[PDB]
Design an enzyme around this catalytic site. Structure first.
Site, PDB file in Angstrom:
ATOM      1  N   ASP A   1      48.035  59.100  14.367  1.00  0.00           N
ATOM      2  CA  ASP A   1      47.109  60.221  14.216  1.00  0.00           C
ATOM      3  C   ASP A   1      45.686  59.708  14.001  1.00  0.00           C
ATOM      4  OD1 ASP A   1      47.010  59.198  11.667  1.00  0.00           O
ATOM      5  OD2 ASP A   1      47.176  61.138  10.657  1.00  0.00           O
TER       6      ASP A   1
ATOM      7  N   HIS B   1      50.286  64.376   9.770  1.00  0.00           N
ATOM      8  CA  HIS B   1      51.601  64.165   9.158  1.00  0.00           C
ATOM      9  C   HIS B   1      52.557  65.340   9.338  1.00  0.00           C
ATOM     10  CE1 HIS B   1      50.070  60.885   6.145  1.00  0.00           C
ATOM     11  NE2 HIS B   1      50.068  60.485   7.405  1.00  0.00           N
TER      12      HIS B   1
ATOM     13  N   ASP C   1      50.013  53.968  10.550  1.00  0.00           N
ATOM     14  CA  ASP C   1      49.039  54.646   9.707  1.00  0.00           C
ATOM     15  C   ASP C   1      48.501  53.606   8.736  1.00  0.00           C
ATOM     16  OD1 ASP C   1      48.942  57.902   7.939  1.00  0.00           O
ATOM     17  OD2 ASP C   1      47.405  56.616   8.814  1.00  0.00           O
ATOM     18  N   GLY C   2      47.316  53.855   8.197  1.00  0.00           N
ATOM     19  CA  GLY C   2      46.719  52.921   7.263  1.00  0.00           C
ATOM     20  C   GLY C   2      45.511  53.565   6.624  1.00  0.00           C
TER      21      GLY C   2
ATOM     22  N   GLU D   1      43.696  51.325   9.952  1.00  0.00           N
ATOM     23  CA  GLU D   1      44.254  52.138  11.026  1.00  0.00           C
ATOM     24  C   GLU D   1      44.513  51.263  12.256  1.00  0.00           C
ATOM     25  OE1 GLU D   1      41.890  55.818  11.686  1.00  0.00           O
ATOM     26  OE2 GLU D   1      41.680  55.822   9.497  1.00  0.00           O
TER      27      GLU D   1
ATOM     28  N   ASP E   1      52.208  56.208   6.000  1.00  0.00           N
ATOM     29  CA  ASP E   1      51.120  56.422   5.050  1.00  0.00           C
ATOM     30  C   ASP E   1      51.553  56.048   3.641  1.00  0.00           C
ATOM     31  OD1 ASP E   1      48.475  57.580   4.150  1.00  0.00           O
ATOM     32  OD2 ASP E   1      49.797  59.008   3.143  1.00  0.00           O
TER      33      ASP E   1
END
EC number: 3.1.26.4
Length: 151
Positions: free
Chosen positions: A70, A124, A10-11, A48, A134
């Site tokens: 995601d 999430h 995640d980012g 991401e 995250d």
């Protein structure tokens, strides 16, 4: 029997565009390793992508990977866009350069070094590791120490 590894990513930016970071988790044999970095100025999309790239580049040998993210951006890229982009020297249909081509190439190169099973998650909710990534991203974005020269 190849090494089986689970990767979560995640980012995002504190404010897009602006300070941002990525977070990834590698799990093997019940052991986890954290990955994170922050950039003075970048975008959510780049963070991401970077999360997946760094996690994969960490593997020192050919592994069987189960990558869970995601990121709709990453999903679309891997399922659809990358294929057509490469057939046009990394260019869109409307003649136009593929955005963040520097990262996409890097990712594409990393994917080829492993047998990967992609797991596109909704979010999430019901995905602890991704939510953790995250948080790692946020912490890094709060005190970025790198520069995203590709931005």
């Amino acid at each position: 029997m190849l090494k089986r590894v689970e990767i979560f990513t995640d980012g995002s930016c504190l404010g897009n565009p602006g300070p941002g970071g990525y977070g990834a988790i590698l799990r093997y044999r019940g052991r986890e390793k954290t990955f994170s970095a922050g950039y003075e100025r970048t975008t959510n999309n780049r963070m991401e992508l970077m999360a997946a790239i760094v996690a994969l580049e960490a593997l020192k040998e050919h592994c069987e990977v189960i990558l869970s993210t995601d990121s709709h951006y990453v999903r679309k890229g891997i399922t659809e866009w990358i294929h057509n982009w490469k057939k046009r020297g990394w260019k869109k249909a409307d003649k136009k350069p593929v955005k963040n081509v520097d990262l996409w190439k890097r990712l594409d190169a990393a994917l080829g070094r492993h047998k990967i099973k992609w797991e596109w998650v909704k979010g999430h909710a019901g995905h602890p590791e991704n939510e953790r990534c995250d948080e790692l991203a946020r912490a890094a974005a709060m005190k970025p120490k790198l520069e995203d020269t590709g931005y």
